[PDB]
Amino acid sequence: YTNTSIIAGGRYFELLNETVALKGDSVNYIHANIDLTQTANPVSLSAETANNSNGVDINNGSGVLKVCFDIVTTSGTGVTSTKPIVQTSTLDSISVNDMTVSGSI
Amino acid sequence: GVRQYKIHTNLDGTDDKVWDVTNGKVRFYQPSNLGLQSTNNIWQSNGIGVMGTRSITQPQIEFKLETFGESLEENYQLMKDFVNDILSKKFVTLEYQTEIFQVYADLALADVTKTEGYGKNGTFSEKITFDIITKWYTYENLTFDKIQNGKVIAGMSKIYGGTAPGNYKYIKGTSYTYYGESDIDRLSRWDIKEEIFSFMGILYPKLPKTPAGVRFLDDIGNEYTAIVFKTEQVQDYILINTDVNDETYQGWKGTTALNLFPVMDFERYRTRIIEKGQMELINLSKAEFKIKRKADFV
Amino acid sequence: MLEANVYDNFNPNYYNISDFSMPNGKKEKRGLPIPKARCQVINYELWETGYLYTSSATLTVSVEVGDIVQILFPEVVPIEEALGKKKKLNLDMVYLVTDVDESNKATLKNYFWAMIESLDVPNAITKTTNFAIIDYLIDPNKNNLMSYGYFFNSSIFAGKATINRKAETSSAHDVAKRIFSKVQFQPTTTIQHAPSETDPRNLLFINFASRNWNRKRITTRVDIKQSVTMDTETIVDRSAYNFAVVFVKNKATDDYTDPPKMYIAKNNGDVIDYSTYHGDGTDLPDVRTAKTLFYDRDDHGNPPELSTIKVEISPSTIVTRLIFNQNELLPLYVNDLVDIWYEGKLYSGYIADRVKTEFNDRLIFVESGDKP
Ligand SMILES: [Sr+2]
């Protein structure tokens, strides 16, 4: 990740030329792991077998927050396709003028 | 003058730690056997002798581990350190040095003893036994050779000189010999004179996405094996180790280390054993090689 | 060491009953019990599918014949049960105890092969797709051992089932082996708690799923250093005497009075009469394997067809099996399509089994054939 900024659990961090190892001929689920107890380096990355997002409330309580952001599909040699995780925007009421939809409502 | 024994945690590597078992605080003394046992498979029929194949067998070296320490605390700290350091790495390379040679042996810890028969200021006198992985090999630097153009001589070289419009004479023996070749700087030979068994090459690639690595040719100019990699971006260098025990095929870009094994061409890499001939550089700008070649008795 | 859960025999005469009252109120099948003893599996040779060898391991607790052994690993295997749906499944090695000696060393048989035991299947069932055979084989109402569910990758078992010889009644073992050879897959039994949080039952399922729904072919190299064991297997049963001294009975004498006609199989695959040959020997085999055949003339009186003789002298599928140590540079797991390079020769096939021992981690590679 040459230059990728991520806001996980309201915590901002930048990935500057951070390389993560992958599994051959597998669908790798890249996770952003936040552990507040690890005061020196709280954010760590991991390529996993499945989407192991926990949703741990790190701001109010304790624990390690895991959240998938990228899905890397690989072959025997390298990477075949990359699909990023959807960015959910939970809202109560919208007062908008115009809208353009690429999928469906 | 006198011989030198040196235990190495990891030779050919950045994380090396050396213990002098000849001059240091912990010393090796009176090696059990440095020679060799051979089994020739000889069968005799009616007084006539027939010989099979010789299996050169290497025997366990048993040393006399001896620590020299100012206090009981010091010698206990020496035994805990030296042994764990041998245990920490899967195998340890013992260096044998004398006035004439500098051989190496790959060893594995077979047996170490700890007893309560302490000398003065609590000094150990124990037996350390090692298992032979590879006995006696030469770790040396392998470099390419350059070819230079021969000097131009009037009457001897092919030139149209002297009186116009030039002249070159056919003589007997002296006649005309070509000076050299235009752009002789293209010719380079990585000469292999004896059979080598493993190597630690530092390859610097040229173009990305174009297979980069090394290829080996025999005495007749035929390829027998090739370590080549097709990476997406230009690696700063590809660090390759052909050693069987800790095989490494990793690419480096900046401070990041990448495993290049799955990107490698598996068809071309037929053998590890390099034969008499030459080596070529595929898509490489620079290369640094360290060759290790075996010797049964030294 | 590894952790092992020891349960008493999963008797389907007990567990198949749908009397268990679910928290909502519904009546469902009886869930698996709690282990009678938690022990540690030691001095082990544990296979993943049991393709060639049977597992053997000494256990701390005194287990007896019939008991089910669940070997636990602190890792997870993701199986793709649907195109996009991937489920969190825990790594398990489930076996049935077949025999325990004096020194408590138990002979373990992989749950699936110990489940489809003594079951026979007629040709009528094998006429349909591979899904129909799997749905027949995996049934708790028939099998010696209890079964709760089956996970299966639709694409791999989508194809039409392999044709049966003589259209006879075959054992569940022989058909599964014949099917698993063509589909290039092997089954893995797994114990895991019910998917729904409401259902508190612990269940046993059979796995026919992979990490990729649409399996991709891998290209790798196997070095001589990995203690490689090369041996040749036969997928299809075809005859071994390439040359045939064929005799035809005379109608008038009702005897074999007439001289024999010799038939030779060429390198291409065709079968010709030996007398008809006009070549240089380059198109004929390197070794002559021969047999004498006796045939009875048909009701019409015509000699037996060339094609009928051809089937009996036709070659069998020579397949190469490679057993080697796990390479940490390029790991190869069970149920993966691979193209292995060994000593300058290319072999193509799949990873059938995996041995988890104290000393090494090894793989069984089966060359599927179908090269030209
Ligand atoms: Sr090394």
Domains, chain A, in order of start with CATH, read 1-85 (2.60.520.10)
Q: What are the structure tokens assigned to A40, written together?
A: 């020196």
In angstroms, the CA A38 to CA B135 distance is: 47
β partners of residue B145: B189
**Domain termination site, one of B105, B135, B165:** B135
Q: Is the domain of B129 the same as that of B180?
A: no
Is residue C323 domain-shared with residue C277, that is, in the same domain?
A: no
- Contact between chains at B254 and A17 (C-beta distance less than 8 A): yes
How many CB atoms are closer than 10 A to CB C23?
A: 10
- Helices C130-137 and C172-182 meet at what angle, rounded to 10? 140
Chain B within 8 Å of C344 (Cβ-Cβ)? yes
| C300 and C311 housed in the same domain | yes
Cβ distance B94 to B59 under 8 Å? Answer: no
Please tell me the distance between residue B79's alpha carbon and the centre of ligand 1 in angstroms. Answer: 24
Q: Do residues B292 and B147 both lie within one domain? A: yes
- For chain A, the residue count is 105
Query: B126 and B180: one domain?
Result: no
Exposure of B257 in the CB half-sphere (CA atoms within 13 A): 5
B205 near B190, Cβ under 8 Å? no
Question: Same structural domain for residues B229 and B118?
Answer: no
3-state secondary structure of C123: helix
Number of domains forming the structure of chain C? 3
Q: Is B246 on the interface with C (CB under 8 A)?
A: no
**Is C185 exposed, middle or buried (CB count within 10 Å of its CB: 0-12, 13-18, 19+)?**
buried
Q: Can you tell me the distance from the alpha carbon of A81 to that of A27, in angstroms, rounded to the nearest whole number?
A: 9
Q: Is the CB of residue C124 less than 8 Å away from at least one CB of chain B?
A: no
Shared domain for C10 and C97, answered yes or no, is: yes
Residues C222 and C89 in one domain: yes
Let me know whether B122 and B169 are in one domain: no
- If we measure between CA atoms, which residue out of C218, C157, C233 comes closest to residue C350? C218
Residues of A in contact with B254 (CB under 8 A): 17
What is the domain extent for residue B56?
A: 1-135
Question: Same domain, yes or no, for C97 and C4?
Answer: yes
| Residue carrying the six token digits 């698993």 | C180
> Residue C358's domain is classified under what CATH number?
2.30.300.20
Q: Are B221 and B231 in contact (CB under 8 A)?
A: no
Q: Are B288 and B144 in contact (CB under 8 A)?
A: no
Same-domain status, B103 and B162: no
Identify the burial level of B125 via C-beta atoms within 10 angstroms of its C-beta, where 0-12 means exposed, 13-18 middle and 19 or more buried. middle
Tokens of C159: 């194809």
User: In terms of residue numbers, what domain contains C66?
Assistant: 1-110+210-234+318-372
Which of B266, B268, B270 should one mutate to test binding to chain C, selecting the residue with the greatest count of C CBs within 10 A? B266
Give the number of residues written for chain B: 298
**Same domain, yes or no, for B92 and B153?**
no
Instruction: Note whether C80 and C138 are same-domain residues.
Output: no
C227 and C241 co-located in one domain: no
State how far residue C90 is from chain B, nearest Cα, in angstroms: 27
Reduced to 3 states, what is the DSSP secondary structure of residue A63?
coil
State the smallest CA–CA distance between residue C327 and chain A in angstroms. Answer: 13
C218 contact residues in A (CB cutoff 8 A):
24-25, 75-76
Task: State whether B213 and B271 are in the same domain.
Answer: yes
Scan for tokens 């390419």, then name that residue: B144
CATH of the domain at C191: 3.55.50.50
Query: What are the φ and ψ backbone dihedral angles of B243, each rounded to 5 degrees?
Result: -55, 130
Which residues are within 8 A (CB) of B183 and not within 5 positions of it... i.e. 6 or more apart? Answer: none
The alpha carbon of residue C267 is apart from the nearest alpha carbon of chain A, in Å, by 36
The amino acid present at C356, given as its one-letter code, is K
Residues from chain B contacting residue C343 (CB–CB below 8 Å): 270
- What is the distance in angstroms between the Cα of B240 and the nearest Cα belonging to chain C? 13
Out of B77, B106, B135, pick the residue that ends a domain. B135
Chain-centre distance of CA B283, in angstroms?
A: 23
Instruction: From A48, A92, A88, select the one nearest A70 (Cα to Cα).
Output: A48
Nearest residue of chain B to residue C347 (CA atoms): B267
Q: Which residues of B197-210 are buried (b: 16+ CB within 10 A; e: fewer)?
A: bbbbbebbbeeeee
Chain B closest-CA separation from residue A105 CA (Å):
40
Tokens of C210: 């992979």
Same domain assignment for residues B68 and B140: no
Residue numbers of B between 232 and 251 with CB closer than 8 Å to A: 232
Cα–Cα distance, C247 to C233 (Å, whole number): 32
- C219 has a chain B CB within 8 A of its CB: yes
> Is there a contact between B149 and B184 (Cβ–Cβ < 8 Å)?
yes
DSSP 3-state of B261: helix
Q: If you search the block for the tokens 């094996």, which residue do you land on?
A: B225
Residue among C221, C225, C343 whose CB faces B266 most closely: C221
**CB-based neighbours (< 5 A) of ligand 1, an ion:** B 10, 12-13
Residues B254, B177 share a domain: yes
Q: CB atoms < 10 A from the CB of B15, how many?
A: 7
Q: What value does the CA radius of gyration of chain A take, rounded to a whole number of Å?
A: 16
| C-alpha separations of C95 from A19, B144, C29, C65, C323 in Å | 41, 59, 22, 11, 22
Tokens of C227: 């203690």
CB contact under 8 A, B270 and C344: yes
Distance between CA atoms of residues B132 and C73, nearest Å = 35
Cα separations in angstroms, C16 against C33, C88, C94, C119, C204: 13, 26, 19, 18, 12
CATH code: domain of residue B141 = 2.60.120.880
CATH of the domain at B14: 2.40.30.210
Structure tokens at B264: 């490698």
Q: Strands C337-342 and C218-221: what pairing? A: parallel
Using the beta-carbon criterion (under 8 Å), do C77 and A49 form an inter-chain contact? yes
Q: Tell me, yes or no, whether C271 and C322 share the same domain.
A: no
> Tokens in use for B93?
């390379």
Q: In C224-359, where do the E strands start and end?
A: 229-234, 243-248, 261-265, 271-273, 290-295, 318-325, 337-342, 345-357
* Resolution for this PDB entry, in angstroms: 3.9
DSSP codes joined into one string, B31-59: -S--S-EEE--EEEETTEEEE---EEEPP
DSSP C4-23: EEEE----HHHHT---EE-T
| B157 shares a domain with B295 | yes
Q: Looking at the structure, do residues B167 and B294 belong to the same domain, yes or no?
A: yes
Shortest CA distance to A44 belongs to which of A55, A31, A54, A28? A31
Q: Which candidate from A27, A49, A76 shows the least CB-CB separation from C219?
A: A76
Other Cβ atoms closer than 10 A to B237? 18
The residue from B135, B170, B203 where one domain ends is B135
Cα-to-centroid distance, B241 and ligand 1 (Å): 8
Number of domains chain B contains: 2
Please count the residue pairs, one from chain A and one from chain C, whose beta carbons lie less than 8 angstroms apart.
33
Residues C222 and C196 grouped into a single domain: no
Answer whether C220 touches B (CB < 8 Å): yes
C221 CB within 8 Å of a chain B CB: yes
- Tell whether B258 lies on the interface with A, counting CB pairs under 8 A: yes
What are C's interface residues with A at a Cβ cutoff of 8 A? 76-78, 80, 86-88, 211-212, 216-220, 330-331, 336
CB B213 within 8 A of CB B203: yes
Name the residue in chain C with its Cα closest to that of A22. C330
User: B70 CB near a chain C CB, below 8 Å?
Assistant: no
A2 part of contact set with chain B, CB < 8 Å: no
**Omega before A42 within 30 of 0, i.e. cis:** no
Q: Which of C204, C205, C222 is nearest to C351 (CA)?
A: C222
- C329 C-alpha to ligand 1 centroid (Å): 16
Six-digit token pair at C105?
Answer: 């060393």
Cα(C135) to ligand 1 centroid in Å equals 53
Q: What is the DSSP letter of B177?
A: B
With CA atoms as reference, report the closest residue to B238 among B266, B208, B204. B204
Q: Tell me the one-letter amino acid at C5.
A: N
| B262:A24 CB<8 A | yes
Select the residue from A17, A20, A72, A82 to test the B interface by mutation, using most B Cβ atoms within 10 A: A17
DSSP state of C163: P
Q: Are strands B92-97 and B102-112 parallel, antiparallel or unpaired?
A: antiparallel
Task: Give C225's DSSP letter.
Answer: G
Can you read off the two tokens belonging to residue C298? 């048909």
Distance from the A13 Cα atom to the nearest Cα atom in chain C, whole angstroms = 29
The three-class DSSP label of residue A82 is strand
Contact B247 C329 (CB under 8 A): yes
Which residue among A17, A21, A78 places its CB closest to the CB of B263?
Answer: A78
Contact B276, B187 (CB under 8 A): no
Same domain, C130 and C216: no
Instruction: Please name the chains neighbouring B, where neighbouring means 3+ C-beta pairs under 8 angstroms.
Output: A, C
